[PDB]
């Protein structure tokens, strides 16, 4: 429970099913905003149900931020359900539950973004300290597919990843957070996404 | 179009108090200019004067979707619009009055504006006589002379609240009904 991992689909089934996989670390950002790098992807793969992504959140500045947020957030006092209390993971599921891959349409992909809500359905993320647990949450990802994905995750020492560029003004992130509460049916959409992604309970998802 | 006024019910039946954010400490953004007993409830009027808070709200409006949203019926007012997206509700603690993501009681939706008369006129549940009393009281207060609001809370604390607001169940629906309960007349910058 030292490292922070994230995983989920960036797309659930022109097309990018030909520039995959991307095993090289891509930056993980927030709401496609510049200077919001929080970590790196540990692999983008094509699988039966879509393009699955895995990554690690390493940005110390961001982890500090996320940590301060969880301290005052309602998630800090929220009653335990099925899992032990993990403010960090829970605040992430309240704040940035979605995933979005950025690409040009026709260095083919620039980054993966954590966001308030994915534009594509079933693009809900799963945050965790255990990569295997994280990937196993997706019942739509076969055993062989998972084993493969994890092989890539473990083959990389997070300790060798460069420091993410996270300096963006906090106001900019706050504005996105404010705008999110007004995204219509966000909570409903978020609930559907969970199903579309075939995520298994228990998870720290907040909807 | 300089000063910032806020108006709305803190309770719908049918000495200046500080105006804060989500009942948090050190989030005074201004002062209540009066709490009035009107037919439909307790109507509140206040002036948003905190320079720090106004700069922040202004900074937020600049990068918010509100600064890019197409004109509807009214002219663009990023500051007013971000306040209606961020803190559209009111809640009376009398200790203080807080601007919230959603009011504790129904019908407590706020109306932000630069014109106090326009603000109060949005509430058709407030009679003409009541409005005249409220406005006479309002304009009898020179704003450039109220004590500076203590706005020093870490930005983190406010952001946590904004993130939580996003997960308040039925928030946008309750805000819509709150508007009906308060009998607010269009056009207004409310976002629900
Ligand atoms: K491989």
- Check CB contact under 8 Å for B156 and A181: no
Closest by CA to A46, choosing from A8, A17, A24, is: A17
Give 3-state DSSP helix, strand, coil % of chain A, rounded to 5.
35, 25, 40
What residues of A are annotated to the active site? 32, 100, 111
The residue count of chain B comes to 192
The residue count of chain A comes to 207
DSSP codes of every residue in B25-93:
TTB--EEEEEEEEETTEEEEEEEE--HHHHHHHHHHHHHSGGGTSPP-SS---HHHHHHHHH--EEEE-
Chain A residues touching residue B53 (CB < 8 angstroms): none
Beta strands in B77-155, from DSSP E residues, in sequence order: 89-92, 97-100, 111-113
CA distance A17 to A50: 9
- Check CB contact under 8 Å for B167 and A207: yes
Distance (angstroms) between ligand 1 centre and the Cα of A92 equals 28
- Give the distance from residue B111's alpha carbon to the nearest chain A alpha carbon, in angstroms: 17
Per-residue CA distances from A146 to A44, A47, A152 (Å) = 12, 10, 10
Determine the 3-state secondary structure of A40 from DSSP: strand
Per-residue CA distances from A71 to A60, A77, B77 (Å) = 16, 9, 34
DSSP state of B148: P
Contacts of B172 (CB under 8 A, 6+ apart): A181, A182, A184, B192
Chain A residues touching residue B172 (CB < 8 angstroms): 181-182, 184
DSSP state of A119: S
- Give the distance from residue A167's alpha carbon to the nearest chain B alpha carbon, in angstroms: 15
Closest by CA to B30, choosing from B45, B10, B12, B8, is: B45
Closest by CA to B60, choosing from A46, A171, A116, is: A171
Other CB atoms within 10 A of residue A65 CB: 18
CA distance B145 to B138: 14
Would you state the structure tokens that stand for residue A61, as one six-digit string?
A: 């500045």
CA distance A199 to A44: 18
Please name the residue of chain B whose CA is at the shortest distance from the CA of residue A180. B166
DSSP state of A160: G
Would you state the structure tokens that stand for residue A75, as one six-digit string?
A: 């998630």
Q: Please report the domains of chain A, with CATH numbers, ordered by start residue.
A: 1-207 (3.20.16.10)
CA distance B59 to B62: 5
- Check CB contact under 8 Å for A73 and B166: no
């Amino acid at each position: 429970a030292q490292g922070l991992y994230v995983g989920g689909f960036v797309d659930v089934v022109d097309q990018v099913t030909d520039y995959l996989p991307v095993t090289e670390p891509l930056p993980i950002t927030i709401e496609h905003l510049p200077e919001t790098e929080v970590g790196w992807t540990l692999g983008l793969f094509q699988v039966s149900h879509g393009i699955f992504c895995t990554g690690a959140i390493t940005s110390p500045a961001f982890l500090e931020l996320a940590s301060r947020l969880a301290d005052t957030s309602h998630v800090a006092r929220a009653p335990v359900k099925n899992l032990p209390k993990e403010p960090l993971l829970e605040i992430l599921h309240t704040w940035l539950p979605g995933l979005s891959l950025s690409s040009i349409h026709p260095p083919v992909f620039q980054h993966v973004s954590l966001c308030a809500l994915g534009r594509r359905r079933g693009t809900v993320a799963v945050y965790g300290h255990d990569a295997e647990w994280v990937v196993s949450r997706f019942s739509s990802v076969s055993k062989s597919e998972r084993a493969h994905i994890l092989q890539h995750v473990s083959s990389c020492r997070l300790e060798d990843l460069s420091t993410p560029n996270f300096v963006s003004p906090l106001e900019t992130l706050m504005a996105k957070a404010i705008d999110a509460g007004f995204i219509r049916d966000r909570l409903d959409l978020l609930k559907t996404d969970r199903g579309v992604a075939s995520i298994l309970s228990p998870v720290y998802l907040k909807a």
